[PDB]
Symmetry: D2
Subunit: 214 residues, 4 copies
């Protein structure tokens, strides 16, 4: 399975996939034939004209490890399926996204970037210590967790078809999206390209609305 | 690929599937483990309590040949993907659903059922003859086809996840649904049972709302 | 209520609407203020950049009378709500779309267009006569109706938000769509313009993908 | 507009509504009549048999102020529309949900509940102080906010139809849901009952799956 490390402790991994470029061609044609130049031209035609329903017949499942603030943005994509770790039902692990000092490149700051990174580490350590103190005193998990910060890592399974994935890439593989989710979208794109090369190349050429891919 | 004949000239065929019973278990648990009693109990637990999002991670693609009046009902299931043969873009084939005389069992009629079957065959033959006359006189396809009856066969690809498929089975594998679409739903159920035995058995035991399966 | 005649016997009527241009502005801003240049500029900004979720907070309900082949295309728009007259549960009325001879403008035909119109009327009359014969002999409605042609009129209620309506207009108020549904989309557009002038004008300027509106 | 205070600093307010009980009746019947015992019986019939599409023609818009951990759960309801305050684009206000000591009723704790409440207040104060320090040193908002806890208040507009609202009530007006979101769902229910009394009463009698309403 293709797995790609993201941020300091995150990842994207492909769990499963149904279909390939030919799945869209066969759905478009409503083919009996389960047997090229013509198939690739059909994908380009569909993409250039906005005929994207055939790409709904290609489906992916990913396992993603990401901070909560990234997952909040990601879960706004309603045309998909999600199942996520629960802070009601589980004790949550001490794992936080701590930005690199390079995260602040281009910003002039009155605290050195290495000190910003330190201050973030210090406050999330204090928050986790309070979380644990509450848990260990008998406070229910679902209440104790409310002190934890948005940079806490979470994990989820995401099942999404290629049409909705292309929408995700338009929006998230783009400079207007937050840099952290851009990094995830770059990995999603790499996996999509590997699994569906003709669809992906046609997408970049004719339909992709963002400004970071190729 | 599993294929099942339906009605006089129809079929349902499985084109592809992503996942199996374990896909729902792994999504529910957000598992790293890609490795029983415990997995089957989890599926039953989910089903008995209405926790059905994990079943969205199992996906099917079918190729279906059905009369238009069956397809009209089927396409009301919005949480799915469809691509269908077009009467704008193609010449449509002379293939009609002609009910068997047994279709009228339990109804007292003042025309013998064999004569009902004959009258249906006769009018659809006349309609197709008019369609062809129009086509052959230069009338555009998209206009000529408007004379064709609702028992004309059509074909489509359908991609659907197991949660939405279970909704389809609740509604269509049921005595209140039209008998013709019941027959399709029985075939969809057979394929679902073969591919996802634990999910299907748990569905019948705990969640299925209809009155025809088992 | 705004009502517009379409084709020979069809219509589109607005039944209800929630909101107006300001609904999108207030949702975008998450406003407490329930109180111009600034509001119109926000709508244009949203539209020009593809930020269309705020328009989901404007909702319409229409009552539409259209032939079945138009309704088949229309009902492919899944992000909406429909309720339609049933040929299982009701006797269907003798009302058919008969194209005008002008429908064939630009096509050279070997049957005069007035004779095409006559041949269509003649076959649908024969089909309805068979339908009625079957009904009156005790054949269940749901079976008798299968002989009826795709130009039979049907009626439905459609509830749709402005984002999905704009998608509908991109696709259906366009020369590539069948002329008959174009005529419906023109009426939908007129009603949308009346109810949401700033959104509609911004849509035409920045986002509309079709080639018939203004 | 109906507004209801929730938790310590939260609220639910109705912003707009389209339709009423009669909207579902008129959609079900595909009525021309825009004019009782019969209308209420139709709603009960629909509800008792699971025929819930007609209720999609009743739509609500709410403005909700809730902590992020409540909003995370709420936003899992995909069949709806949301627009939320952004921590990328805005400075976020110092407003946190601090549980009442009574929140821990039924739990034996080794820290007195008043001290739990104090410890939660203390850590979120420290987190906000770090957030502000980062902002005021020139760290971009979208990065500074990652230290803020899940009990931070957020606000959003929610547009939802009555069918999806009933699903929300089944799931969230229920003892298995987290107590905090139960409190929101109780307020949503009160507003739904006021606006759609026949639908709500039929829902409670025939369809509601939860264990807290009436
Ligand atoms: C840079 C950026 C900044 C953002 N800022 C904010 C913000 O400040 N606040 C905020 O709340 N959100 C914000 N968002 C989130 C944004 O509003 C969308 O929720 C998100 O981008 C998902 O887009 P989508 O609706 O196209 O995706 P999906 O929800 O996956 O929908 C896919 C497609 O299905 C259709 N669709 C799905 N459901 C409906 C429906 N109910 N009605 C109509 N059409 C539907 C649309 O065609 C849509 O494109 C931001 C997103 C980005 C990328
Ligand atoms: C016996 C029978 C008779 C019928 N008679 C008629 C009739 O006379 N007229 C008629 O028009 N239709 C009729 N229908 C069709 C019926 O109204 C539904 O369109 C169909 O059964 C599909 O059901 P669904 O909406 O659950 O499926 P899908 O559209 O696949 O939706 C699946 C689920 O997603 C949710 N959902 C999807 N979209 C929305 C949305 N926009 N809002 C809220 N929830 C949503 C719901 O939880 C729904 O159960 C009939 C169906 C049956 C089975
Ligand atoms: C000129 C023309 C010719 C056509 N020819 C054919 C044909 O030959 N055969 C045929 O079968 N169909 C045909 N169609 C129908 C077409 O494939 C679409 O079904 C229809 O245009 C509705 O578009 P939509 O999916 O954008 O709308 P909706 O279904 O309303 O969806 C709205 C938006 O929500 C999103 N969306 C909704 N559901 C999903 C999902 N499951 N996955 C991903 N994204 C989703 C997409 O962003 C979509 O744009 C044709 C349409 C047109 C206009
Ligand atoms: C007590 C409780 C505990 C929970 N625990 C967890 C947890 O540990 N982890 C977790 O990730 N989530 C958890 N959830 C969230 C839960 O999985 C659902 O996301 C949430 O309840 C919304 O339900 P829904 O999908 O029915 O709603 P919506 O998303 O609004 O969907 C409404 C209806 O539309 C249909 N539907 C919509 N989209 C699809 C689709 N893509 N495929 C098929 N059908 C569709 C279904 O019929 C559905 O009922 C929990 C929820 C509750 C109430
Ligand atoms: N908006 C819109 N969406 C669409 C289409 C469309 O025309 N418009 N259609 C393009 N279609 C095909 C199918 C087969 C071939 C081919 O065999 N050559 C070419 C195109 C199928 C369908 C898919 N979705
Ligand atoms: N992206 C980025 N990187 C940087 C800086 C910057 O402004 N932006 N600069 C911040 N600078 C200092 C030095 C001393 C103090 C102080 O003592 N208080 C504060 C800041 C040094 C320098 C380090 N690298
Ligand atoms: N309405 C609703 N929907 C839900 C759930 C829920 O509680 N309510 N949840 C049940 N969940 C799991 C996950 C793992 C195990 C297990 O490991 N034992 C058990 C249950 C996941 C999630 C899926 N959807
Ligand atoms: N389901 C079903 N099957 C049937 C019948 C029926 O009523 N229902 N009956 C209809 N019956 C006749 C006989 C003669 C004429 C006539 O000459 N006019 C008309 C009907 C015969 C019988 C045949 N089988
Ligand atoms: N893809 C995408 N979708 C979006 C947005 C976005 O940035 N990208 N956002 C634009 N947003 C607003 C809200 C208020 C104002 C204003 O007050 N000036 C301006 C913009 C809200 C949100 C809506 N949807
Ligand atoms: N759009 C359109 N309009 C038309 C025609 C046409 O080709 N296209 N033409 C078809 N023409 C005739 C005349 C006689 C016969 C015949 O007797 N067989 C058949 C066709 C006449 C003319 C009438 N108007
Ligand atoms: N699953 C399912 N969904 C449905 C229906 C159905 O039968 N099954 N139908 C019930 N329908 C009506 C319409 C009018 C009346 C009446 O006038 N008496 C009664 C029922 C409309 C439609 C709505 N959705
Ligand atoms: N819901 C709930 N309410 C409670 C308690 C409880 O267990 N659950 N109890 C906790 N109790 C104390 C007293 C002293 C210390 C200590 O000094 N360490 C710690 C706990 C007192 C009492 C207060 N009210
Ligand atoms: O780039 C963005 C900005 C916002 N949001 C959505 C996610 C949350 O529901 C809400 C606020 O997100 P933040 O701006 O706080 O990340 O809007 C996104 O999806 N992407
Ligand atoms: O059993 C039914 C009856 C109706 N419909 C939907 C399909 C059409 O959109 C409309 C009318 O269908 P008929 O009753 O004419 O089949 O309602 C169904 O989906 N299933
Ligand atoms: O312009 C078109 C052509 C096709 N279809 C969809 C509707 C039917 O599900 C199927 C076949 O439609 P016809 O081409 O037969 O109209 O594809 C459309 O929605 N619009
Ligand atoms: O009662 C619950 C529990 C979980 N979730 C969803 C929301 C988040 O996406 C994820 C984790 O939620 P918490 O258990 O951490 O609240 O699962 C709910 O929607 N409701
Ligand atoms: Cl840990
Ligand atoms: Cl043929
Ligand atoms: Cl009549
Ligand atoms: Cl403040």
């Amino acid at each position: 399975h293709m797995k790609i490390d993201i941020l300091d402790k995150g990842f994207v991994e492909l769990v499963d996939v149904m279909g390939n470029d030919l799945s869209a061609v066969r759905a478009a044609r409503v083919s009996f034939d389960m047997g090229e130049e013509r198939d690739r031209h059909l994908i380009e035609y569909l993409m250039k004209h906005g005929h994207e329903t055939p790409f709904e017949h290609i489906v992916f499942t990913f396992h993603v490890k990401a901070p909560i603030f990234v997952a909040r943005q990601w879960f706004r994509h309603r045309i998909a399926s999600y199942n996520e770790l629960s802070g009601r039902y589980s004790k949550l692990s001490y794992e936080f996204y701590i930005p690199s000092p390079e995260r602040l490149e281009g910003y002039k700051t009155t605290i050195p970037p290495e000190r910003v990174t330190e201050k973030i580490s210090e406050i999330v350590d204090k928050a986790y210590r309070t979380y644990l103190e509450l848990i260990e005193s008998g406070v229910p998990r679902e209440v104790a967790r409310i002190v934890l910060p948005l940079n806490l890592y979470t994990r989820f399974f995401w099942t999404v078809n290629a049409r909705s994935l292309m929408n995700f890439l338009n929006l998230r593989a783009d400079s207007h999206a937050q840099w952290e989710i851009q990094q995830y979208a770059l990995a999603i794109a790499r996996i999509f390209k590997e699994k569906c090369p003709w669809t992906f190349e046609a997408f970049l050429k004719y339909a992709y609305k963002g400004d970071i891919l190729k």
